[PDB]
Each structure stands twice: as structure tokens, then as C-alpha cells.
Amino acid sequence: AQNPNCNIMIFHPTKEEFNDFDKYIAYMESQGAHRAGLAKIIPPKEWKARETYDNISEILIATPLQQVASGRAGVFTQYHKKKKAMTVGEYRHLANSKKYQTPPHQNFEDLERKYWKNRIYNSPIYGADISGSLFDENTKQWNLGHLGTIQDLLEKECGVVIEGVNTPYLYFGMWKTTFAWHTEDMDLYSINYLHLGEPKTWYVVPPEHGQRLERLARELFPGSSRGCGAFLRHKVALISPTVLKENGIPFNRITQEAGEFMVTFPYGYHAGFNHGFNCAEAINFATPRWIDYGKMASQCSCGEARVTFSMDAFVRILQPERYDLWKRGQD
Ligand SMILES: O=C(O)CNC(=O)C(=O)O
Ligand SMILES: [Mg+2]
Ligand code: NI
Ligand SMILES: [Zn+2]
Secondary structure (H helix, E strand, O other), rough: OOOOOOOOOOEEOOOOOOOOOOOOOHHHHHOOHHEEEEEEOOOOOOOOOOOOOOOOOOOEOOEEEEEEEEEEOOEEEEEEOOOOOOOOOHHHHHHHHOOOOOOOOOOOOHHHHHEEEEEOOOEEEEEEEEOOOOOOOOOOOOOOOOOOHHHHHHHHHHHHOOOOOOOOEEEOOOOEEEEEEOOHHHEEEEEEEEEOOOOEEEEOOOHHHHHHHHHHHHHHHHHHHHOOOOOHHOOEEOOOOOHHHOOOOOEEEEEOOOEEEEEEEOEEEEEEEEEEOOEEEEEEEEEEEEHHHHHOOOOOOOOHHHHHOOOHHHHHHHOOHHHHHOOOOOO
């Protein structure tokens, strides 16, 4: 068995290997990358996502979100308070202000220590889930707006034609912006490209150990767990590496820098934080190996998780018994 300790693997494809996306994901899995739940892909030196980032300031962040925390430093929830619209140029100036900017630090480990000590005492503002793309249309390799769609994969594997579309999303971050513990909708893959700016630190639990994280979460968030049998779908709960280690939960960590891709694998729980002003692009995708995970994915039916149009069909075809209850949650 490849990668039996479930370590995060880092890949350096050549320009020739970067042509065929599906083939390279299958290669990484042949080497055991999915056992970690997360992999890093450094593009070949010949590749670029676009020519420059000099002209992005007029993108609108229609609904910036202030991430307000409750709890203790290592075990907290966050809620998202909606703020007034602002452009990317306005948000960058905000991120760089004395109130929000990254503090002085020695290295990524010192910054990580400062994040976990102090996150709860601040409320950073995140531009999230903004439909769009920063890949140039002429970038042919690993262009996250030109991937094969999940609806087409389900049709190729299972023969059933379904409605829905699959497009990328942009994220604009600042120091302390936080992504809560979660798996993807329908336990899909994700791919994330850090276009510019400061790094993103990730934490991940191997898929084979995901139920250990769920059991700890039910212990640490006992009201939330009574409210919903899949409350991590709400994307609000944070648990620090120190708390995970104290409770014996297997996990790994890695820092993504500008110009790098990360892939999350089906049922790989992940969480993390931004180091300073940055912009990322991400999208979900599927492979044949995903289908069995889609069929088994938990679902929130309490009403909180509320998701895209295209998840309807995935539930309807892969999880017909759950469909009626899940759809009541959506309506
Ligand atoms: O970058 C972020 O805020 C969150 N992204 C992801 O969870 C992802 O790519 O799966
Ligand atoms: Mg612009
Ligand atoms: Ni994710
Ligand atoms: Zn719920």
C-alpha cells in the first residue's frame, strides 16, 4: 500500500505531465497521495496562470464577511456577519491597515503560534465564494475554468444525464481569515490555486480517519451535534492542532504559497487560515473513484447548510432514499 502513514505529498509535474489533468490526478493517487486527504502540486516553471495581476482592483466583493468567533482559543465557532460591498482595491487597502495587517513574525511556525493564540480576539473580513476566474483564457493546462464537469463525469460513469453546472470561485483573504473544518459538498474533490499574495496554512485529516474527527467534534460542540447530525456541513467549527494532538486525532499540516495548487481528496476534512492579503481560486471536481464517496456522503437536513443548485441532482441520483428529507432542508 502506497503512503501508509498518510503524509501530505508534494508533486513537481513536468510541462508534458501537466497536459492531461485527469491522468495526473490518477498518477498522484497511484503513489498514495489521496491517503493524506491533501496534496500540493508545484506547476512546471514554463507555466503561468495569466500574464499579470496588475488589473484586478475593480473586481467587486458584493458581500464581504466579518468572521466573528465564540469559544476558547483552540475550540471555537465563527459566524459570518455581512458587510457593505467593496472593490478588491478597497479590500486590499483594508487588509494592509494597522487594524488588520499581519504582525511581525519570524517564520511560518511563529505566525501559526500567533494565529492559534490570538485569532478569537479579532474579526477579520473575508471575500468568499465569488463566482469567477482569474485564469487567462489562453492558459490551456490546469485552468480551473476549463475542467471536465462533475455532471459529465456522473454521465460518463453511470449513464444518467443531469441538470447543473460547475464553475470556479474566487476568495480574497487577509490575516486570520479562517476556513472551518469541513469536507466538500457530496465529499467531492477540490482544487485550489493561490493566485497572489500571502500564504495559506492548511490542516487535514486522512479520509480513512475522518470519523475520528467527527466524534471529537460531537464531543466539543455538543449543542451543535444535537441540532444536526452533520453539523460540520455548516462550516463553522474550529479545533486547533494542539487540541487535535491532545485527543489523538491523526492530521497533517502544510503551507501553500502563491503559484501553488492544492488538491483535497474525497472525505478529507480540512481547515486553515490566511497569512495576509491573498487571492485564491477553487472549484470542485470528480473522478471515477469519487462516485462511491458521493453515495455515502453525509448530509445536513436541518436547514443550515443551504447549497448550490447542482447538488440537487447529485443527491437525487446517488442518494434517492435521503432525497426527500434533504430537499425539505433546502425548502
Ligand atoms: O481557501 C479557502 O478559504 C477554502 N478553500 C477550500 O476549502 C478548498 O479549496 O477546498
Ligand atoms: Mg479589475
Ligand atoms: Ni474545501
Ligand atoms: Zn445542519
